[PDB]
Amino acid sequence: DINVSEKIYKWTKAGIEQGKEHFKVGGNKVYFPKARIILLRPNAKHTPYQAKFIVPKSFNKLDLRDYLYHIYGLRAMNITTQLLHGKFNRMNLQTTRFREPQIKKMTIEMEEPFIWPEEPRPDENSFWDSTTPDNMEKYREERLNCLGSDANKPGT
Amino acid sequence: ARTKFTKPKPKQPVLPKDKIRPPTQLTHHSNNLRITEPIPPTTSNLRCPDDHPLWQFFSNKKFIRSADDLPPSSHIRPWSIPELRHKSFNDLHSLWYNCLREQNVLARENHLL
Amino acid sequence: MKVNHSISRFRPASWFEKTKIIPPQVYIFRNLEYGQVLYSQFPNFSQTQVDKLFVRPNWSNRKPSLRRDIWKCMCVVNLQNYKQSVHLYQNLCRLRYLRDVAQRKESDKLRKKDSNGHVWYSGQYRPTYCQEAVADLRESLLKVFENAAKKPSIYWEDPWRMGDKDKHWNYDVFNALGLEHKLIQRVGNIAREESVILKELAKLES
Amino acid sequence: SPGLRWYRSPIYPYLYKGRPVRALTVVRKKHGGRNNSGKITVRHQGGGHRNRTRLIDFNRWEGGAQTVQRIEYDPGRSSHIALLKHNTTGELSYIIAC
Amino acid sequence: SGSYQHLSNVGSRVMKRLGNRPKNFLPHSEKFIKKSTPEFMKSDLKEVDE
Amino acid sequence: AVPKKKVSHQKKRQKLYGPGKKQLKMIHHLNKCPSCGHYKRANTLCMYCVGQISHIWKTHTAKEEIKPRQEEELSELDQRVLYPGRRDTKYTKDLKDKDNYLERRVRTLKKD
Amino acid sequence: KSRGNTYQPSTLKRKRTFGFLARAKSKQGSKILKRRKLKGRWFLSH
Amino acid sequence: LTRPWKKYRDGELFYGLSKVGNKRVPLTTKQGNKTMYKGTRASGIGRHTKFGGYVINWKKVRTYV
RNA sequence: UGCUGACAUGAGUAACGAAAAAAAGGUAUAAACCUUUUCACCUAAAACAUAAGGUUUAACUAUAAAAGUACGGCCCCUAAUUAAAUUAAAUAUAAAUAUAUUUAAGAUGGGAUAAUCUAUAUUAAUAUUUAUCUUAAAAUAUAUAAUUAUAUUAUAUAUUAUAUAUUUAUAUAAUAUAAACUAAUAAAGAUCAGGAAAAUUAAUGUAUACCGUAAUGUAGACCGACUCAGGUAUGUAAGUAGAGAAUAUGAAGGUGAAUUAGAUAAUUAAAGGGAAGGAACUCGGCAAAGAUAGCUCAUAAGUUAGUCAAUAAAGAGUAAUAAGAACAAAGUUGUACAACUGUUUACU
RNA sequence: AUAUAUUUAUUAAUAUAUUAUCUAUAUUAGUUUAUAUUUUAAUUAUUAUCAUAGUAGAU
């Protein structure tokens, strides 16, 4: 009667009309999921109609969509998956090197737009204020990497 | 190789004026075209809904909960196992999903921090 | 065998009239990787189209990959006649050429620069190219209507992509025409069932 | 070339100038001197063209008279094969030719 | 930071080794920590184990 | 080709510091700049005064910065949406702190 | 003919020859692994 | 200069701190050949087709009820 | 020539690893970083795509988006091959183990459909190499029931007009460029005889998994202890020239570098030129020098008959007459020895 | 062709300044060239770089 992609589109439309899932629900029923997702800020390359998450490394695209539907009530129409590389890191050169974690980030497309709330001022929020920790780090760098007559050299 | 002795090649065989076909396309692009400055997309055209389900990942629509916005440690306690033991299955399930939601909100924030 | 498809050449109005695969319209495609835009007479495209547009590539404006996933439909613009659509398409190509080769310095001056004097980027995504394409589309359409029933329309991917309905898109000629700025229905996977959606749109205005 | 000077070979025009029947041929695995051990056991044996081995009947049990459809060249045997087709049975098989 | 370390448990053995430093090289470990910390942060009293 | 012995303290020092050729000389040829009453080299321009004049020229002969209209008239929210922030690399950060590795010119003493 | 570049990496080959599972599968490799464990080695194989 | 603050030849690398390091460390998805497929415990979902495709088996797909 | 550590001396010496720089401004801070402009070098590349490799080196943490058609992997299947696997008694064996057979693994290879987009699922039955010549045919001059003439010669496309169906459908004839190159085709030459392995309709499905995706890849991002003139797979690879990917240039692109500035003694390297000589050098013409088309003719002695000799040498015409790019092209003969084309001491 | 000026009446025109000499489509797959098509898409003075100082004659 009709092609496969068209049938799929029709099914999706029907599901939307229903207010049921816009996708075939699986049979492997997870009652108590332990997976968390980190809603990320949007990059320049994305639109207001997209949202990107850090998700579990063993999280499926379909699984993510299901999670978004049932936990939150949001319906992701299209989903992409970006498994990042794990660059080598080490505490110091005396320690063994190992990779940082491969981290899975899934973009979604959604039928209504969204823009984040504006990040707070330094005076307003206590935590979101990068001056202090950065200063502390700088001080640590100075003190450990200070050698001889740079002990007398005044602090930055 | 090219040399003192190399006579030049003949010109390519052109097809006569009468035999050549007229091209299928006659009228091309407008000569008047002008490079205008770009038109950057604006938020004014959007109508981001006040109850967009992605707000559920925030708490009171705050980019970050301040120390005052957070629940204090003395006021808050985790559930006791005995307390949980006399709760229904559906209730427990709901509690679990609320917990998970809270973690997600915190996880987003924690990551940012 | 048959080598050429509909996409394999530039198709004039007469060819379209003979065939009638799609209505009189032009398709526009964002590049999710780089932010570059790709115009086409058809809802599909090939390497030939890419070659035609991306003629003078550099580090800033690299010749894009033909991988199908990173290409996504920015805008589907419908017009009153096949000939008109062809003319619009030609105008867009001309504008692109001007921006890349002929009047490149002027275009560069017009763009947004970062510190260290480069055209603003995030990764290799540059958001100026899309903006230029919208501006270029607006220009080409305007020229077409100056040169010059169905009310023409521009089906957008996204309503946000308009600069502003007051500042731009409110010329007298457009108003006279009845240029309806509609958007494509997102009741399904927009990226995956894109071709189906485009077909449905085509069917709608015929 | 000073190397065609002493290349003398036999001409057999009646010989077949086509491929052998593919059902009667099996690939000729090359061991190249080495044995299971993996160590050159027969010295001086190396690598050449990708030859196929043609299953040439030596018992010639069958029985009855068969017509020689053609006489080909087997890369291995110095001899010549022959695509004997059973006059009645209707079947092709090879045999060292006389 | 620009870390991503906090979303995983990578290089676990190395972390354990660092975390569970031998107690007889505890002065060595803390000498540099003391140096790093400003005067208003640092405390005189010994940071006892859990 | 090769030293036969450990060269002594005496012999390395008389080699290095004994000859006047190898020593540093006093810069006797300083004199007053007429524009600002400070030390400068003889038969040389004052680096302060010429620098000041160069600065003046820059301030006057200044090619106007190109601010595109569309970016100048963006809303703040809209601008944030379009062009979000980013973490700079360690290298980038190092490059940014120019005062760490870039030497500004010192002023000379006032002549008497 | 300049020497020195005798190592010519190719992940697949390395994993075949010096990978953990190759060691495990052979008796000799299993013995090696055991020996490394006894020594105290953090990294038993590629 | 690779970096303008370092005019002279310190023993600093073109990138990173040390070239050398422990080579014996488990592979990731990014490493290896074109044929090297690690995977991330994400998709024991359906079944691989004879032709190279894939067919989802929905009774073996995770829902979050 | 004890070991570990510290620090001396040589010594502020040699060196800063093929190189094109300038300016102006970022920025009254810049030989060294960014921007603009000029100049230059690479261009069958120092370019654009990639493979492999790797301290992510990236246009970076707000990060490298794939149902499939010029996407790969995964997956299906195998090659070479591998395997505490396999088969009262599989065979053999100080033990280890080995062998043979099965069985499971093994890509560098095979693998369905598709822009007028495409549907893989479950079930029922039942191809070594190599060539594209000839000839013939169709065609424009001749001349106009000729001979010459030289080109055309299998494929792919739009158009027009029909023709058949009723404005699609398809057939039909009609016009329509040189050179490459490509894919499906056909027919065809030799000896060196040219891989493996994985049904059909019909019915019923198909709410599209995972994984690679940056940049780097003739290199500062792999191998070479170094940001190492070494090593490192593939397709592209402006035009104009030409036989050509040779050689010149080089549109575009991408560079101009972890040393500069002066100076240019003796002296060394790398070049250019050189009067009268003309191998007098010297172990020895080592090195350097030497090319009177590269095309078309024409080409001896000898001889195993193979223009082997031979790209012969000389000579000739096309070009050139004072000369006025690069690049290919470097004489002849006797003797010893080895027939030849090859191989060998990776580093004398 | 844009921007001044301006004969003049927006616009012709007058003047200089700048800017430009492309581009698009045939011709049966691709590429390049050739010609028609498209278009405003120009035909002499004098330079420059490269080609080993490009080569050569002098100096």
Q: What is the 3-state secondary structure (H, E, C) of chain C?
A: CCCCCCCCCCCCHHHHHHHCCCCCEEEEEEECCCCCEEEECCCCCCHHHHHHHCCCCCCCCCCCCCCCCCEEEEEEEECCCHHHHHHHHHHHHHHHHHHHHHCHHHHHHHCCECCCCCECCECCECCHHHHHHHHHHHHHHHHHHHHCCCCCEEEECCHHHCCCCCCCCCCHHHHHHCCECCECCCCCCCCCCHHHHHHHHHHHCC
Distance of CA C34 to the CA centre of its chain: 15
Residue A93 and residue B105: Cα distance in Å, rounded?
A: 37
Within 10 Å of residue C128's Cβ, how many Cβ atoms?
Answer: 24
Residues 2-61 of chain H sitting with CB below 7 angstroms of strand I? 2-4, 6-19, 21, 23, 29-40, 42-43, 45-46, 48-56, 58
Residue C160 · residue A47 · CB < 8 Å: yes
For chain C, the residues whose C-beta falls within 8 A of a C-beta of chain A are 32, 35, 69, 122-123, 125, 127, 158, 160-161, 186-193, 195-197, 199
Residue A138 and residue F25: Cα distance in Å, rounded?
A: 42
CA H50, C1' I124: Å apart? Answer: 21
Spell out the residues 6+ positions from residue H5 whose beta carbon is closer than 8 angstroms to its own: F94, F100, F101
Backbone angles phi, psi at C128, to 5 degrees: -75, -35
CA B15, C1' I188: Å apart? Answer: 37
Residue A133 and residue A138: Cα distance in Å, rounded?
A: 9
Helix axes A131-145, E26-36, angle to 10 degrees: 120
Do F84 and C122 make contact, defined as CB atoms within 8 angstroms? yes
Spell out the residues 6+ positions from residue A71 whose beta carbon is closer than 8 angstroms to its own: A33, B97, B100, B101, H64
CA C7, C1' I151: Å apart? Answer: 36
For residue H5, give how far its alpha carbon lies from the nearest alpha carbon of chain F (Å): 5
**B5 Cβ nearer than 7 Å to chain I strand:** yes
- Residue C75, CA distances (Å) to A13, A73, C162 in order: 21, 29, 11
Residue H30 and residue E19: Cα distance in Å, rounded?
A: 30
Backbone angles phi, psi at C195, to 5 degrees: -55, -40
The DSSP symbol for A56 reads -
Rounded to 10 degrees, what is the CA torsion of C81, C87, C92, C93?
130
- Residue H2, CA distances (Å) to C196, F93, H7, H9, H11 in order: 51, 15, 9, 11, 13
Residue A41 and residue B112: Cα distance in Å, rounded?
A: 9
Shortest CA distance from E4: residue in chain B: B111
What stretches of B1-113 show up as alpha helix (H) in DSSP?
Answer: 81-85, 89-112
Q: How was this structure determined?
A: cryo-EM
Residue C169 · residue C162 · CB < 8 Å: yes
Residue D72 · residue D15 · CB < 8 Å: yes
Question: Concatenated DSSP letters for G1-46?
Answer: ---S------HHHHHHHHSHHHHHHSHHHHHHHHHHHHHT-S----
Residue A2 and residue C203: Cα distance in Å, rounded?
A: 15
**C191 Cβ nearer than 7 Å to chain I strand:** yes
A58 shares contact with chain E (CB less than 8 Å) = no
The answer, yes or no, to whether G and D have at least 3 beta-carbon pairs within 8 Å is no
What stretches of A19-130 show up as alpha helix (H) in DSSP?
Answer: 61-67
Shortest CA distance from B43: residue in chain F: F78
Residue B49 and residue A112: Cα distance in Å, rounded?
A: 7
E19: amino acid identity, one letter: G
Residue B105 · residue B59 · CB < 8 Å: yes
Residue B111 and residue E8: Cα distance in Å, rounded?
A: 12
- Residue F92, CA distances (Å) to B112, C117, C123, C125, D84 in order: 21, 15, 14, 19, 83
Q: Is F36 annotated as a binding residue?
A: yes
Residue A125 and residue A129: Cα distance in Å, rounded?
A: 7
Residue C62 and residue C72: Cα distance in Å, rounded?
A: 18
Q: Is F39 helix (H, G, I), strand (E, B) or coil?
A: strand
For chain G, the residues whose C-beta falls within 8 A of a C-beta of chain H are 10-12, 15, 43-46
| Positive or negative torsion for Cα C146, C148, C152, C157 | negative
Burial class (CB in 10 A: 0-12, 13-18, 19+), A45: buried
Spell out the residues 6+ positions from residue D42 whose beta carbon is closer than 8 angstroms to its own: D33
* Chains touching chain D, criterion 3+ CB pairs below 8 Å: none
**A5 Cβ nearer than 7 Å to chain I strand:** yes
Within 10 Å of residue C117's Cβ, how many Cβ atoms?
Answer: 6
B107 shares contact with chain A (CB less than 8 Å) = yes
F57 shares contact with chain A (CB less than 8 Å) = no
For residue E18, give how far its alpha carbon lies from the nearest alpha carbon of chain B (Å): 23
Residue E2 and residue F87: Cα distance in Å, rounded?
A: 7
